[PDB]
Coordinates of N, CA, C and O and ligand atoms in Angstrom, one line a residue:
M87 N -27.8 -52.8 -3.2 CA -28.8 -52.8 -4.2 C -28.3 -52.9 -5.5 O -27.1 -53.1 -5.8
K88 N -29.1 -53.2 -6.6 CA -29.1 -53.1 -7.8 C -29.7 -51.9 -8.6 O -31.3 -52.0 -8.1
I89 N -29.3 -51.1 -9.6 CA -30.2 -50.4 -10.5 C -30.9 -51.4 -11.4 O -30.3 -52.1 -12.1
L90 N -32.3 -51.5 -11.1 CA -33.1 -52.3 -12.1 C -32.9 -52.1 -13.6 O -32.8 -51.0 -13.9
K91 N -33.4 -53.4 -14.4 CA -33.2 -53.2 -15.7 C -34.4 -52.5 -16.3 O -35.4 -52.3 -15.7
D92 N -34.1 -51.8 -17.4 CA -35.1 -50.8 -18.0 C -36.4 -51.3 -18.3 O -37.5 -50.4 -18.3
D93 N -36.6 -52.8 -18.1 CA -37.8 -53.3 -18.4 C -38.6 -53.8 -17.0 O -39.4 -54.5 -17.3
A94 N -37.9 -53.4 -16.0 CA -38.7 -53.9 -14.6 C -39.9 -53.0 -14.5 O -40.0 -52.1 -14.4
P95 N -40.7 -54.1 -14.0 CA -42.2 -53.5 -13.6 C -42.0 -52.7 -12.7 O -43.0 -51.9 -12.5
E96 N -41.2 -52.8 -11.6 CA -41.0 -51.6 -10.5 C -41.2 -50.1 -11.1 O -41.5 -49.5 -10.0
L97 N -40.5 -50.0 -12.0 CA -40.4 -48.9 -12.8 C -41.6 -48.2 -13.2 O -41.9 -47.1 -13.0
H98 N -42.7 -48.9 -13.3 CA -44.1 -48.5 -13.6 C -45.0 -48.4 -12.3 O -46.3 -48.1 -12.5
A99 N -44.6 -49.2 -11.6 CA -45.7 -49.4 -10.3 C -45.8 -48.1 -9.1 O -44.8 -47.2 -9.3
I100 N -46.6 -48.1 -8.4 CA -47.1 -46.9 -7.5 C -46.2 -47.3 -6.4 O -46.5 -48.5 -5.7
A101 N -45.1 -46.6 -5.6 CA -44.6 -46.6 -4.5 C -45.4 -46.2 -3.1 O -46.2 -45.4 -3.5
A102 N -45.5 -46.9 -2.0 CA -46.3 -47.0 -1.0 C -46.0 -45.8 -0.2 O -44.7 -46.0 0.1
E103 N -46.7 -45.2 0.5 CA -46.2 -44.6 1.4 C -45.8 -45.0 2.4 O -46.0 -46.1 3.1
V104 N -44.6 -44.3 3.4 CA -44.0 -45.0 4.3 C -44.8 -44.6 5.9 O -45.1 -43.6 6.1
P105 N -45.4 -45.6 6.3 CA -45.8 -45.6 7.7 C -45.1 -44.6 8.6 O -43.6 -44.7 8.6
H106 N -45.7 -43.5 9.3 CA -45.0 -42.9 10.0 C -44.3 -43.3 10.9 O -44.5 -44.2 11.9
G107 N -43.0 -43.0 11.1 CA -41.9 -43.3 12.3 C -41.2 -44.6 11.9 O -40.2 -44.9 12.7
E108 N -41.5 -45.5 10.6 CA -41.0 -46.5 10.0 C -39.3 -46.2 10.1 O -39.0 -45.2 9.8
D109 N -38.7 -47.0 10.5 CA -36.9 -47.0 10.6 C -36.7 -47.0 9.3 O -36.8 -48.2 8.5
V110 N -36.1 -46.2 8.5 CA -35.9 -46.4 7.0 C -34.2 -45.8 7.1 O -34.0 -46.1 5.8
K111 N -33.6 -45.8 7.9 CA -32.4 -45.6 7.8 C -31.4 -46.4 7.3 O -30.5 -45.8 6.3
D112 N -31.3 -47.5 7.4 CA -30.5 -48.8 6.4 C -30.7 -48.5 4.8 O -30.0 -48.7 4.1
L113 N -32.2 -48.7 4.6 CA -32.8 -48.4 3.4 C -32.3 -47.1 2.6 O -31.7 -47.3 1.6
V114 N -32.2 -46.1 3.5 CA -31.7 -44.9 3.1 C -30.2 -44.8 2.7 O -29.6 -44.3 1.6
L115 N -29.6 -45.6 3.5 CA -27.7 -45.9 3.2 C -27.4 -46.6 2.0 O -26.9 -46.1 1.2
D116 N -28.4 -47.7 1.7 CA -28.5 -48.8 0.7 C -28.9 -47.7 -0.7 O -27.9 -48.0 -1.7
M117 N -29.7 -46.8 -0.6 CA -30.4 -46.2 -1.7 C -29.2 -45.2 -2.2 O -29.0 -45.1 -3.5
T118 N -28.5 -44.5 -0.9 CA -27.6 -43.5 -1.4 C -26.3 -43.9 -2.0 O -25.7 -43.6 -3.1
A119 N -26.1 -45.5 -1.7 CA -25.1 -45.9 -1.8 C -25.3 -46.5 -3.3 O -24.2 -46.3 -4.4
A120 N -26.2 -47.0 -3.9 CA -26.9 -47.4 -5.2 C -26.7 -45.9 -6.2 O -26.1 -46.0 -7.1
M121 N -27.1 -44.8 -5.6 CA -27.3 -43.5 -6.4 C -25.6 -43.2 -6.5 O -25.4 -43.1 -7.9
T122 N -24.8 -43.2 -5.8 CA -23.6 -42.7 -5.9 C -22.5 -43.8 -6.8 O -22.0 -43.2 -7.7
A123 N -23.0 -44.9 -6.6 CA -22.1 -46.1 -7.2 C -22.4 -46.1 -8.8 O -21.6 -46.4 -9.7
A124 N -23.5 -45.5 -9.0 CA -24.2 -45.2 -10.4 C -23.8 -44.1 -11.1 O -24.0 -44.0 -12.3
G125 N -23.2 -43.1 -10.3 CA -22.8 -41.8 -10.6 C -23.9 -41.0 -10.8 O -24.1 -39.8 -11.9
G126 N -25.0 -41.2 -10.2 CA -26.2 -40.4 -10.2 C -26.6 -39.5 -9.2 O -25.4 -39.0 -8.2
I127 N -27.3 -38.6 -9.7 CA -27.6 -37.1 -8.7 C -29.0 -37.3 -8.0 O -29.3 -36.4 -7.3
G128 N -29.5 -38.2 -8.0 CA -30.8 -38.4 -7.6 C -31.2 -40.3 -7.9 O -30.7 -40.7 -9.0
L129 N -32.2 -40.4 -7.1 CA -32.6 -42.0 -7.2 C -33.9 -42.0 -6.3 O -34.0 -41.5 -5.3
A130 N -35.0 -42.9 -7.0 CA -36.2 -43.3 -6.1 C -36.0 -44.8 -5.8 O -35.6 -45.4 -6.6
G131 N -37.1 -44.9 -4.8 CA -37.1 -46.3 -4.4 C -37.5 -47.3 -5.3 O -36.8 -48.4 -5.6
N132 N -38.6 -46.9 -6.4 CA -38.7 -47.8 -7.5 C -37.2 -48.4 -8.1 O -37.6 -49.5 -8.6
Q133 N -36.5 -47.2 -8.4 CA -35.3 -47.9 -9.3 C -34.6 -48.9 -8.7 O -33.8 -49.4 -9.2
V134 N -34.6 -49.2 -7.3 CA -33.7 -50.2 -6.5 C -34.8 -51.1 -6.0 O -34.5 -52.2 -5.6
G135 N -35.8 -51.4 -6.7 CA -36.8 -52.5 -6.2 C -37.5 -52.2 -5.1 O -38.2 -53.1 -4.5
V136 N -37.6 -51.0 -4.3 CA -38.2 -50.7 -3.2 C -39.2 -49.8 -3.3 O -39.4 -48.6 -3.9
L137 N -40.4 -50.4 -3.2 CA -41.8 -49.8 -3.6 C -42.3 -49.0 -2.3 O -43.3 -49.2 -1.9
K138 N -41.5 -48.1 -1.9 CA -41.7 -47.2 -0.9 C -41.5 -46.0 -1.2 O -40.3 -45.3 -2.0
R139 N -42.0 -44.9 -0.7 CA -42.1 -43.4 -1.3 C -40.6 -42.9 -0.6 O -41.0 -41.9 0.2
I140 N -39.4 -43.1 -0.9 CA -38.4 -42.3 -0.5 C -37.7 -42.1 -1.8 O -37.5 -42.8 -2.6
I141 N -37.1 -40.8 -1.7 CA -36.0 -40.2 -2.7 C -34.4 -40.0 -2.1 O -34.8 -39.3 -0.7
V142 N -33.8 -40.1 -2.7 CA -32.6 -39.6 -2.4 C -31.9 -38.7 -3.3 O -32.2 -39.1 -4.6
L143 N -30.9 -37.7 -3.0 CA -30.4 -36.7 -4.1 C -29.2 -36.2 -3.5 O -28.8 -36.4 -2.6
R144 N -28.5 -35.8 -4.6 CA -27.3 -35.0 -4.5 C -27.2 -33.7 -5.4 O -26.5 -33.9 -6.7
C145 N -27.9 -33.1 -5.5 CA -28.3 -31.9 -6.1 C -27.7 -30.6 -5.7 O -27.4 -30.5 -4.8
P146 N -27.7 -29.6 -6.7 CA -26.7 -28.3 -6.4 C -27.3 -27.7 -5.0 O -26.5 -27.2 -4.1
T147 N -28.6 -27.6 -4.9 CA -29.3 -27.0 -3.6 C -29.9 -28.0 -2.7 O -30.6 -27.4 -1.7
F148 N -29.9 -29.2 -2.6 CA -30.4 -30.1 -1.8 C -29.5 -31.5 -2.0 O -29.7 -32.1 -2.9
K149 N -29.1 -32.1 -0.9 CA -28.3 -33.1 -0.8 C -29.0 -33.9 0.3 O -29.1 -33.4 1.4
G150 N -29.6 -35.1 0.3 CA -30.1 -36.1 1.1 C -31.1 -36.6 0.8 O -31.5 -36.8 -0.4
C151 N -32.1 -37.0 1.9 CA -33.2 -38.1 1.7 C -34.7 -37.1 1.5 O -34.3 -36.1 2.5
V152 N -35.4 -37.5 1.3 CA -37.0 -37.3 1.5 C -38.0 -38.3 1.7 O -37.9 -39.0 0.7
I153 N -38.2 -38.5 2.7 CA -39.4 -39.6 3.1 C -41.0 -39.1 2.8 O -41.0 -38.0 3.2
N154 N -41.9 -39.8 1.9 CA -42.9 -39.4 1.5 C -43.1 -37.8 0.8 O -43.9 -36.9 1.5
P155 N -41.8 -37.7 -0.2 CA -42.2 -36.4 -0.5 C -43.2 -35.8 -1.3 O -43.8 -36.5 -2.1
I156 N -43.6 -34.5 -1.4 CA -45.0 -34.1 -2.1 C -44.6 -32.5 -2.5 O -43.8 -31.8 -1.7
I157 N -45.3 -32.1 -3.7 CA -45.0 -31.1 -4.1 C -46.1 -30.1 -3.8 O -47.1 -30.3 -3.9
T158 N -45.9 -29.0 -2.7 CA -47.0 -28.4 -2.2 C -47.1 -26.9 -2.8 O -48.1 -26.4 -2.7
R159 N -46.0 -26.3 -3.6 CA -46.0 -25.1 -4.4 C -45.3 -25.5 -5.7 O -44.3 -26.1 -5.5
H160 N -45.7 -24.6 -6.7 CA -44.9 -25.0 -8.0 C -45.4 -23.6 -8.6 O -46.5 -22.8 -8.7
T161 N -44.2 -23.0 -9.7 CA -44.8 -21.9 -10.6 C -45.6 -22.4 -11.6 O -45.6 -23.7 -12.1
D162 N -46.6 -21.6 -12.3 CA -47.1 -21.9 -13.5 C -46.4 -22.0 -14.8 O -45.2 -21.8 -14.7
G163 N -46.8 -22.5 -15.6 CA -46.1 -22.9 -17.0 C -44.8 -24.1 -16.8 O -44.8 -24.5 -15.6
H164 N -44.3 -24.5 -17.8 CA -43.0 -25.3 -18.1 C -42.1 -24.5 -18.7 O -42.1 -23.6 -19.4
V165 N -40.9 -25.3 -18.4 CA -39.4 -25.0 -19.1 C -38.9 -26.1 -19.2 O -39.3 -27.2 -19.1
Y166 N -37.5 -26.0 -20.3 CA -37.2 -27.1 -20.7 C -36.0 -27.7 -19.6 O -35.2 -27.1 -18.9
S167 N -36.1 -29.0 -19.7 CA -35.0 -29.9 -18.9 C -34.8 -31.1 -19.3 O -35.4 -31.9 -19.7
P168 N -33.4 -31.0 -19.9 CA -33.0 -32.3 -20.9 C -32.6 -33.1 -19.4 O -31.6 -32.7 -18.7
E169 N -33.2 -34.7 -19.3 CA -32.7 -35.5 -18.4 C -32.5 -36.4 -18.7 O -32.7 -37.2 -19.9
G170 N -31.4 -37.2 -18.3 CA -31.2 -38.9 -18.2 C -31.9 -39.4 -16.8 O -32.6 -38.8 -16.2
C171 N -31.6 -40.7 -16.7 CA -32.2 -41.5 -15.8 C -31.1 -42.7 -15.7 O -30.7 -43.4 -16.7
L172 N -30.7 -43.0 -14.4 CA -30.0 -44.3 -13.9 C -30.7 -45.5 -14.6 O -30.1 -46.4 -14.9
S173 N -32.1 -45.5 -14.6 CA -32.7 -46.8 -15.2 C -32.5 -46.7 -16.6 O -32.9 -48.1 -17.4
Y174 N -32.3 -46.0 -17.4 CA -32.5 -45.7 -18.7 C -30.8 -45.4 -19.3 O -30.9 -44.3 -19.9
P175 N -29.8 -46.0 -19.1 CA -28.4 -45.6 -19.4 C -28.5 -45.1 -20.9 O -29.1 -45.9 -21.8
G176 N -27.6 -43.9 -21.3 CA -27.7 -43.6 -22.6 C -28.7 -42.7 -23.1 O -28.6 -42.3 -24.3
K177 N -29.9 -42.7 -22.6 CA -30.9 -41.7 -23.1 C -31.2 -40.6 -22.6 O -31.0 -40.5 -20.9
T178 N -31.1 -39.6 -23.2 CA -31.5 -38.2 -22.5 C -33.0 -37.8 -23.3 O -32.9 -37.7 -24.5
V179 N -33.7 -37.1 -22.3 CA -35.1 -36.6 -22.8 C -35.5 -35.2 -22.6 O -34.9 -34.9 -21.6
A180 N -35.8 -34.4 -23.5 CA -36.0 -33.2 -23.2 C -37.6 -33.3 -22.6 O -38.7 -33.3 -23.0
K181 N -37.6 -32.7 -21.1 CA -38.6 -32.9 -20.2 C -39.1 -31.4 -20.3 O -38.7 -30.6 -20.0
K182 N -40.8 -31.3 -20.1 CA -41.3 -29.9 -19.4 C -41.4 -30.4 -17.9 O -41.8 -31.3 -17.6
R183 N -40.7 -29.2 -17.0 CA -40.6 -29.1 -15.8 C -41.1 -27.8 -15.4 O -40.9 -26.7 -15.7
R184 N -41.6 -28.0 -14.1 CA -42.1 -26.6 -13.1 C -40.7 -26.1 -13.1 O -39.5 -26.6 -12.9
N185 N -40.2 -24.8 -13.3 CA -38.9 -24.0 -12.9 C -38.7 -24.0 -11.5 O -37.5 -24.1 -11.0
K186 N -39.8 -23.8 -10.8 CA -39.8 -23.7 -9.1 C -40.7 -24.7 -8.5 O -41.9 -24.8 -8.9
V187 N -40.2 -25.5 -7.5 CA -41.3 -26.4 -6.7 C -40.8 -26.2 -5.1 O -39.3 -25.7 -5.1
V188 N -41.8 -26.5 -4.4 CA -41.7 -26.6 -3.0 C -41.7 -28.0 -2.6 O -43.0 -28.5 -2.7
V189 N -40.8 -28.6 -2.0 CA -41.2 -30.2 -2.0 C -41.3 -29.9 -0.2 O -40.2 -29.6 0.4
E190 N -42.0 -31.0 0.3 CA -42.2 -31.2 1.7 C -42.4 -33.0 1.9 O -42.7 -33.7 0.9
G191 N -41.8 -33.3 3.2 CA -41.8 -34.5 3.6 C -41.1 -34.7 5.0 O -41.1 -33.7 5.6
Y192 N -40.4 -35.7 5.1 CA -39.7 -36.2 6.2 C -38.1 -36.4 6.1 O -38.0 -37.0 5.0
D193 N -37.1 -36.2 7.0 CA -35.8 -36.8 7.0 C -35.7 -38.1 7.5 O -36.9 -38.6 8.0
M194 N -34.8 -38.7 7.5 CA -34.7 -40.1 8.1 C -34.8 -40.1 9.9 O -34.9 -41.0 10.1
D195 N -34.7 -39.2 9.9 CA -35.3 -38.9 11.7 C -36.7 -38.4 12.0 O -37.0 -38.2 13.1
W196 N -37.5 -38.5 10.8 CA -38.9 -38.1 11.2 C -39.1 -37.0 11.1 O -40.2 -36.4 12.0
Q197 N -38.2 -35.6 11.2 CA -38.2 -34.5 11.2 C -38.9 -33.9 10.2 O -38.5 -34.3 8.8
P198 N -40.2 -32.5 10.1 CA -40.7 -32.5 8.9 C -39.6 -31.5 8.3 O -38.8 -30.6 8.8
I199 N -39.5 -31.6 6.5 CA -38.3 -30.9 6.0 C -39.1 -30.0 4.8 O -40.2 -30.6 4.2
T200 N -38.7 -29.0 4.2 CA -39.2 -28.3 3.5 C -37.9 -27.9 2.5 O -37.0 -27.3 2.9
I201 N -38.3 -28.0 1.4 CA -37.2 -27.6 0.1 C -37.5 -26.9 -1.1 O -38.8 -27.2 -1.8
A202 N -37.3 -25.7 -0.9 CA -37.6 -24.7 -2.4 C -36.3 -24.8 -3.1 O -35.1 -24.7 -2.8
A203 N -36.9 -25.2 -4.3 CA -35.9 -25.2 -5.4 C -36.3 -25.0 -6.6 O -37.4 -24.7 -6.6
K204 N -35.2 -24.7 -7.5 CA -35.4 -24.1 -8.7 C -34.6 -24.5 -9.6 O -33.5 -25.1 -9.1
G205 N -34.8 -24.5 -11.1 CA -33.8 -25.2 -12.1 C -33.2 -26.6 -11.7 O -34.2 -27.4 -11.4
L206 N -32.1 -26.9 -11.7 CA -31.6 -28.3 -12.0 C -32.1 -29.0 -10.7 O -32.7 -30.3 -10.8
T207 N -32.2 -28.5 -9.6 CA -32.7 -29.3 -8.3 C -34.1 -29.0 -8.1 O -34.6 -30.5 -7.9
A208 N -34.7 -28.4 -8.9 CA -36.2 -28.7 -9.2 C -36.9 -29.9 -10.1 O -37.6 -30.5 -9.8
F209 N -35.6 -29.9 -11.1 CA -36.0 -30.9 -12.3 C -35.9 -32.1 -11.5 O -36.6 -33.0 -11.9
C210 N -34.5 -32.2 -10.8 CA -34.0 -33.8 -9.8 C -35.6 -33.8 -9.0 O -36.0 -34.9 -9.4
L211 N -35.9 -33.0 -8.6 CA -37.2 -33.4 -7.5 C -38.3 -33.8 -8.4 O -38.7 -34.8 -7.7
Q212 N -38.6 -33.3 -9.4 CA -39.9 -33.7 -9.9 C -39.4 -35.0 -10.7 O -40.5 -35.7 -10.5
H213 N -38.6 -35.4 -10.9 CA -37.9 -36.3 -11.7 C -38.1 -37.3 -10.8 O -38.7 -38.8 -11.0
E214 N -37.8 -37.5 -9.5 CA -37.5 -38.6 -8.3 C -39.2 -38.8 -8.0 O -39.2 -39.9 -7.8
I215 N -39.9 -37.8 -7.9 CA -40.9 -37.8 -7.2 C -42.0 -38.5 -8.7 O -42.5 -39.4 -8.2
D216 N -41.5 -38.4 -9.9 CA -42.5 -39.0 -11.0 C -41.9 -40.5 -10.7 O -43.0 -41.3 -10.8
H217 N -40.8 -40.8 -10.3 CA -40.8 -42.4 -10.1 C -41.4 -43.2 -9.4 O -41.9 -44.3 -9.5
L218 N -41.8 -42.3 -8.2 CA -42.7 -42.9 -7.2 C -44.2 -43.2 -7.4 O -44.7 -43.8 -7.0
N219 N -44.7 -42.5 -8.6 CA -45.9 -42.7 -9.2 C -46.0 -43.4 -10.4 O -47.0 -44.0 -11.1
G220 N -44.5 -44.2 -10.8 CA -44.6 -44.9 -11.7 C -44.4 -44.2 -13.2 O -44.5 -44.9 -14.2
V221 N -44.0 -43.1 -13.1 CA -43.5 -42.0 -14.2 C -42.2 -42.0 -14.5 O -41.6 -41.6 -13.6
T222 N -41.7 -42.4 -15.8 CA -40.6 -42.2 -16.1 C -40.2 -41.4 -17.4 O -41.2 -41.1 -17.9
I223 N -38.9 -41.0 -17.9 CA -38.6 -39.9 -18.9 C -39.0 -40.7 -20.2 O -38.7 -42.2 -20.3
Ligands
LIG428 NI1 -26.0 -53.5 -4.3
LIG429 NI1 -41.3 -49.4 -19.6
LIG430 NI1 -50.7 -27.2 -9.1
LIG431 ZN1 -34.9 -41.5 -13.1

């Protein structure tokens, strides 16, 4: 895969729900490889031209994929999160993020997963889910 250029339309598009049970194993492998090759800690389908709701992460309290990730709970208010993005090399933005989130979805074997995250990992998750909605820093 390739990390799309900062002017790619896919970055602003909405990624489609993955049909339940669809074989995503190779896609996740490719996405993980793209993320690590670029020295990232997270990556979303849109960033590699895959308009499917798949994220991959290598964050302090979560490493792996989430298929159809959703935020089911979060803290009120916002906190400071300085973030870069593999799609925007050289740019750091001070984002407002929820300090804690719970993210739910499916793993590559279509087992339901739940991720309770705070701080950096919570920011990671919110940033990647944003990508799937065409939202960038
Ligand atoms: Ni490649
Ligand atoms: Ni743009
Ligand atoms: Ni809410
Ligand atoms: Zn990003």
